[PDB]
Amino acid sequence: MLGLKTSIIGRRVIYFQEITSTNEFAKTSYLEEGTVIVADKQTMGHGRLNRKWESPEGGLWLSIVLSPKVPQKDLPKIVFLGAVGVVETLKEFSIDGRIKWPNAVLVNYKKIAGVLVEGKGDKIVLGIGLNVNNKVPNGATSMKLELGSEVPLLSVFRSLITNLDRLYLNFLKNPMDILNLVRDNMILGVRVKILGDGSFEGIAEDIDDFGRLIIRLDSGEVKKVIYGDVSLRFL
Amino acid sequence: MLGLKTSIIGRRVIYFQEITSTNEFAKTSYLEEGTVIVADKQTMGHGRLNRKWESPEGGLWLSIVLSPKVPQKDLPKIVFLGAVGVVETLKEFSIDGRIKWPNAVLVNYKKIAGVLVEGKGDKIVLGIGLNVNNKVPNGATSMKLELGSEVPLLSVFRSLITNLDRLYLNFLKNPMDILNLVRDNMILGVRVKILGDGSFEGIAEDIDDFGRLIIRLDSGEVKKVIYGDVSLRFL
Ligand SMILES: Nc1ncnc2c1ncn2[C@@H]1O[C@H](COP(=O)(O)OP(=O)(O)OP(=O)(O)O)[C@@H](O)[C@H]1O
Ligand SMILES: Nc1ncnc2c1ncn2[C@@H]1O[C@H](COP(=O)(O)OP(=O)(O)OP(=O)(O)O)[C@@H](O)[C@H]1O
Ligand SMILES: O=C(O)CCCC[C@@H]1SC[C@@H]2NC(=O)N[C@@H]21
Ligand SMILES: O=C(O)CCCC[C@@H]1SC[C@@H]2NC(=O)N[C@@H]21
């Protein structure tokens, strides 16, 4: 009854009034490529390292099952499809979303969305949490708060799925294209701090051909960051 | 993201751009009670017996998984929940539908919807096909044709699911209530012919406490028709 006209993403959609986590359901269940798992609310939503992700009613909490036929070296780029898709959807609603490398989107430096990719070999799950009309934790924002009025949640869903389908289809053809879109919509030229096994500060210059964040430290040393288990903090 | 407020029917919804048959999928797949299977188009949609059910884009083709904890003798009334739900939804859109015992809804004697109940294991599958904006076979009709304008498909879905959830919840407690709703909304007092071996004609008088169609033959004999492979024609 939804009438989606996408090629892969959105071929099937499983909607839940409530779920533990769309990412967990997607990783666990036997699902075909392109199936979207979406829920009004999540009771156990999470980000990286099992950190809690607040998922009250009003927001867009979904996961997409992907089976990309691409070399191992290209899989780390899937998170960017989610980040860019969100930025494109936000621009459609006239919201200035900017990417915080490599899995978040901010509006005036406040987090409005997060992306979490999980994958075991053949199946890759692309999880996206976007604050639309829901209450958010301090330090975050939502589409409603930015526009000053409620936004039709289904319209946001339709917009995002359409954008993601296009981005994904092109990714399979030209896996490098997404990097340019990330560059054009990411926060750069400002000081950041990388928190991993130890830490360091510097200017976030750009992302390289592998999607690694290029940081120039005050000494001039250049470091290439692979997100993994590191956190980026703005100064 | 659909924000359904129903109690049982609609707790989960599985949407397909395209499917063979929502009834077939619902029967062969493990699904919790209340799960709704819906598709934009069915390639192998079917009615009773071995007859095709045209399911092009624009219509509402869905199946609902139920596992009613009620006496065995009440189970045959599930088909009526579907028929009455359609009638209630049609009224909301200012269309007057009448039930053609035991599984169809007509508008000015033109078929606008059909109901098909099947069961695998101890789960019951309630299938409903309603013509909304889609083209229909000659002699049939649709919400669009009756209103002279496009009808928001999702609005029809929301309305129908809401009515069905209410009807089902009450059915679980008061399984006889549905019968009076059918009586007040079905075509009675007219001549009909029951096809097949031992065929016969008479006046469709009412439905009894089991949902059987009561027919008075010209001789005065009264026959009780159970709704199975029953083919009925208006004379
Ligand atoms: N609904 C929400 N909207 C915005 N931020 C949220 C929401 N729920 C939780 N958070 C915050 O997001 C964090 C998510 O975990 P995680 O460290 O994996 O995020 P990240 O995207 O990798 O890093 P960052 O929060 O710096 O963008 C939580 O620790 C919490 O501070
Ligand atoms: N989209 C549709 N809208 C209305 N009628 C349809 C549609 N697709 C098929 N039909 C008609 O509905 C019939 C469906 O099969 P089935 O015999 O099981 O229905 P039925 O309700 O028992 O028949 P009837 O109401 O005509 O006595 C087909 O034989 C066909 O004539
Ligand atoms: O910012 C992050 O660290 C990532 C957050 C990812 C949130 C989404 S909500 C849909 C999906 N289900 C989950 O449990 N997590 C992701
Ligand atoms: O009038 C009839 O004989 C019954 C038609 C039932 C049609 C619906 S469409 C949704 C579901 N899937 C099917 O293949 N049939 C039912």
Tab-separated table of all heavy atoms in Angstrom, chain A residues 124-154:
chain	number	residue	atom	x	y	z
A	124	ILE	N	25.239	-7.314	5.347
A	124	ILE	CA	25.626	-6.059	5.981
A	124	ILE	C	24.336	-5.365	6.398
A	124	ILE	O	23.391	-5.294	5.616
A	124	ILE	CB	26.388	-5.128	4.995
A	124	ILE	CG1	27.712	-5.773	4.572
A	124	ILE	CG2	26.624	-3.765	5.631
A	124	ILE	CD1	28.656	-6.074	5.722
A	125	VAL	N	24.285	-4.880	7.633
A	125	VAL	CA	23.097	-4.179	8.116
A	125	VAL	C	23.432	-2.707	8.313
A	125	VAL	O	24.336	-2.360	9.070
A	125	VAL	CB	22.607	-4.763	9.459
A	125	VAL	CG1	21.426	-3.942	9.995
A	125	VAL	CG2	22.200	-6.222	9.264
A	126	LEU	N	22.702	-1.846	7.613
A	126	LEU	CA	22.905	-0.405	7.713
A	126	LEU	C	21.817	0.185	8.608
A	126	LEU	O	20.659	0.274	8.205
A	126	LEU	CB	22.835	0.223	6.315
A	126	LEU	CG	22.785	1.749	6.199
A	126	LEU	CD1	24.020	2.362	6.857
A	126	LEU	CD2	22.719	2.137	4.732
A	127	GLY	N	22.200	0.575	9.821
A	127	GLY	CA	21.254	1.151	10.763
A	127	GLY	C	21.308	2.667	10.793
A	127	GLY	O	22.386	3.254	10.773
A	128	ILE	N	20.141	3.302	10.836
A	128	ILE	CA	20.062	4.757	10.855
A	128	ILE	C	19.023	5.229	11.860
A	128	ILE	O	17.886	4.759	11.859
A	128	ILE	CB	19.666	5.311	9.465
A	128	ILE	CG1	20.710	4.906	8.423
A	128	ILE	CG2	19.512	6.837	9.527
A	128	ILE	CD1	20.299	5.218	6.994
A	129	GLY	N	19.426	6.148	12.726
A	129	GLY	CA	18.508	6.705	13.701
A	129	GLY	C	18.474	8.195	13.425
A	129	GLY	O	19.521	8.840	13.457
A	130	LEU	N	17.295	8.739	13.132
A	130	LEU	CA	17.144	10.164	12.827
A	130	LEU	C	16.062	10.774	13.705
A	130	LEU	O	14.931	10.294	13.721
A	130	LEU	CB	16.768	10.348	11.349
A	130	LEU	CG	16.311	11.734	10.871
A	130	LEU	CD1	17.461	12.728	11.012
A	130	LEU	CD2	15.861	11.654	9.412
A	131	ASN	N	16.408	11.829	14.439
A	131	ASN	CA	15.439	12.485	15.306
A	131	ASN	C	14.525	13.364	14.463
A	131	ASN	O	14.984	14.307	13.822
A	131	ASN	CB	16.160	13.338	16.361
A	131	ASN	CG	17.021	12.509	17.294
A	131	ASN	OD1	16.567	11.504	17.849
A	131	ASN	ND2	18.267	12.932	17.487
A	132	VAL	N	13.232	13.053	14.458
A	132	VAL	CA	12.282	13.834	13.682
A	132	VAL	C	11.387	14.671	14.593
A	132	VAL	O	11.634	15.865	14.771
A	132	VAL	CB	11.419	12.916	12.771
A	132	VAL	CG1	10.496	13.749	11.898
A	132	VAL	CG2	12.328	12.060	11.895
A	133	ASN	N	10.373	14.041	15.182
A	133	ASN	CA	9.430	14.730	16.068
A	133	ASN	C	9.585	14.341	17.541
A	133	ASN	O	8.892	14.881	18.402
A	133	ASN	CB	7.992	14.412	15.641
A	133	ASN	CG	7.677	14.894	14.242
A	133	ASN	OD1	8.034	16.014	13.865
A	133	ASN	ND2	7.020	14.053	13.459
A	134	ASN	N	10.486	13.410	17.830
A	134	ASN	CA	10.699	12.927	19.193
A	134	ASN	C	11.496	13.848	20.114
A	134	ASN	O	12.200	14.751	19.666
A	134	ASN	CB	11.428	11.583	19.152
A	134	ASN	CG	12.749	11.668	18.399
A	134	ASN	OD1	12.769	11.867	17.187
A	134	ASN	ND2	13.860	11.519	19.117
A	135	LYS	N	11.382	13.592	21.414
A	135	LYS	CA	12.152	14.336	22.402
A	135	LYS	C	13.550	13.780	22.239
A	135	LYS	O	13.710	12.607	21.906
A	135	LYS	CB	11.655	14.043	23.817
A	135	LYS	CG	10.378	14.782	24.139
A	135	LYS	CD	9.628	14.158	25.302
A	135	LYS	CE	8.135	14.476	25.242
A	135	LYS	NZ	7.861	15.264	23.995
A	136	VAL	N	14.561	14.607	22.478
A	136	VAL	CA	15.941	14.157	22.337
A	136	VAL	C	16.775	14.430	23.581
A	136	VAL	O	16.432	15.285	24.397
A	136	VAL	CB	16.632	14.843	21.132
A	136	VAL	CG1	15.850	14.563	19.856
A	136	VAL	CG2	16.747	16.346	21.371
A	137	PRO	N	17.878	13.690	23.753
A	137	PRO	CA	18.749	13.887	24.917
A	137	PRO	C	19.553	15.175	24.750
A	137	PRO	O	19.858	15.575	23.622
A	137	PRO	CB	19.624	12.641	24.900
A	137	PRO	CG	19.746	12.348	23.435
A	137	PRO	CD	18.325	12.537	22.949
A	138	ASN	N	19.891	15.827	25.860
A	138	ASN	CA	20.646	17.064	25.758
A	138	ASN	C	21.927	16.786	24.972
A	138	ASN	O	22.543	15.737	25.093
A	138	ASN	CB	20.951	17.546	27.179
A	138	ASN	CG	19.669	17.882	27.903
A	138	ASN	OD1	18.650	18.209	27.302
A	138	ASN	ND2	19.752	17.861	29.244
A	139	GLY	N	22.300	17.754	24.118
A	139	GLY	CA	23.430	17.520	23.230
A	139	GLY	C	22.996	17.087	21.825
A	139	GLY	O	23.800	16.859	20.929
A	140	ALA	N	21.668	16.934	21.666
A	140	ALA	CA	21.134	16.526	20.373
A	140	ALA	C	20.058	17.498	19.881
A	140	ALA	O	19.699	18.454	20.558
A	140	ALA	CB	20.542	15.124	20.522
A	141	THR	N	19.574	17.247	18.667
A	141	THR	CA	18.522	18.062	18.078
A	141	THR	C	17.632	17.175	17.201
A	141	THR	O	17.892	15.979	17.050
A	141	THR	CB	19.096	19.245	17.254
A	141	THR	OG1	18.038	20.160	16.958
A	141	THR	CG2	19.729	18.770	15.946
A	142	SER	N	16.577	17.755	16.642
A	142	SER	CA	15.654	16.998	15.805
A	142	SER	C	15.126	17.883	14.687
A	142	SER	O	15.264	19.105	14.737
A	142	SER	CB	14.473	16.505	16.639
A	142	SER	OG	13.623	17.594	16.974
A	143	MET	N	14.509	17.264	13.685
A	143	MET	CA	13.958	18.011	12.563
A	143	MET	C	12.915	19.009	13.050
A	143	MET	O	12.880	20.154	12.598
A	143	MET	CB	13.337	17.052	11.545
A	143	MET	CG	14.368	16.163	10.844
A	143	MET	SD	13.651	15.112	9.562
A	143	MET	CE	13.308	16.335	8.291
A	144	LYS	N	12.074	18.562	13.980
A	144	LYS	CA	11.021	19.391	14.549
A	144	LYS	C	11.592	20.609	15.266
A	144	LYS	O	11.084	21.721	15.110
A	144	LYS	CB	10.185	18.560	15.527
A	144	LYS	CG	9.109	19.342	16.274
A	144	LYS	CD	8.277	18.412	17.154
A	144	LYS	CE	7.201	19.180	17.915
A	144	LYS	NZ	6.326	18.259	18.691
A	145	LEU	N	12.639	20.395	16.055
A	145	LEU	CA	13.265	21.486	16.796
A	145	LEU	C	13.936	22.496	15.873
A	145	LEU	O	13.950	23.694	16.159
A	145	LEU	CB	14.293	20.930	17.786
A	145	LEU	CG	13.730	20.167	18.985
A	145	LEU	CD1	14.854	19.438	19.713
A	145	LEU	CD2	13.021	21.144	19.915
A	146	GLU	N	14.484	22.016	14.762
A	146	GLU	CA	15.161	22.888	13.814
A	146	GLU	C	14.198	23.695	12.949
A	146	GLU	O	14.457	24.860	12.649
A	146	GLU	CB	16.100	22.070	12.926
A	146	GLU	CG	17.249	21.447	13.697
A	146	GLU	CD	18.131	22.487	14.363
A	146	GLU	OE1	18.238	23.608	13.820
A	146	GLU	OE2	18.725	22.179	15.419
A	147	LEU	N	13.087	23.081	12.557
A	147	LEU	CA	12.103	23.761	11.719
A	147	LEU	C	11.054	24.514	12.529
A	147	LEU	O	10.384	25.410	12.009
A	147	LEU	CB	11.411	22.753	10.802
A	147	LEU	CG	12.306	22.103	9.747
A	147	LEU	CD1	11.540	21.001	9.029
A	147	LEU	CD2	12.787	23.160	8.763
A	148	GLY	N	10.917	24.154	13.798
A	148	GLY	CA	9.945	24.812	14.650
A	148	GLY	C	8.543	24.255	14.489
A	148	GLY	O	7.579	24.841	14.983
A	149	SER	N	8.427	23.122	13.801
A	149	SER	CA	7.132	22.484	13.575
A	149	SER	C	7.287	20.996	13.263
A	149	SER	O	8.334	20.560	12.790
A	149	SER	CB	6.405	23.167	12.416
A	149	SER	OG	7.152	23.059	11.214
A	150	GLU	N	6.232	20.230	13.527
A	150	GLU	CA	6.233	18.793	13.281
A	150	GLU	C	6.369	18.461	11.799
A	150	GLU	O	5.864	19.182	10.938
A	150	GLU	CB	4.949	18.160	13.825
A	150	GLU	CG	4.796	16.683	13.501
A	150	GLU	CD	3.549	16.075	14.115
A	150	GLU	OE1	3.500	15.950	15.357
A	150	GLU	OE2	2.620	15.725	13.359
A	151	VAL	N	7.048	17.353	11.516
A	151	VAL	CA	7.274	16.892	10.151
A	151	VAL	C	6.640	15.513	9.970
A	151	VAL	O	6.797	14.640	10.821
A	151	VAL	CB	8.788	16.781	9.849
A	151	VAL	CG1	9.003	16.316	8.424
A	151	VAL	CG2	9.466	18.128	10.078
A	152	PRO	N	5.918	15.301	8.857
A	152	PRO	CA	5.272	14.009	8.590
A	152	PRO	C	6.330	12.918	8.541
A	152	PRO	O	7.134	12.865	7.613
A	152	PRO	CB	4.601	14.227	7.237
A	152	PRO	CG	4.305	15.693	7.241
A	152	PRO	CD	5.570	16.282	7.815
A	153	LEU	N	6.327	12.053	9.548
A	153	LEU	CA	7.314	10.987	9.636
A	153	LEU	C	7.382	10.113	8.383
A	153	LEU	O	8.471	9.746	7.941
A	153	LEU	CB	7.035	10.138	10.879
A	153	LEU	CG	8.108	9.147	11.315
A	153	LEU	CD1	9.456	9.841	11.469
A	153	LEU	CD2	7.688	8.526	12.639
A	154	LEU	N	6.231	9.789	7.799
A	154	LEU	CA	6.221	8.963	6.593
A	154	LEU	C	6.900	9.668	5.417
A	154	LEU	O	7.547	9.024	4.593
A	154	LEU	CB	4.789	8.577	6.219
A	154	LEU	CG	4.626	7.773	4.927
A	154	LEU	CD1	5.368	6.437	5.023
A	154	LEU	CD2	3.145	7.537	4.683
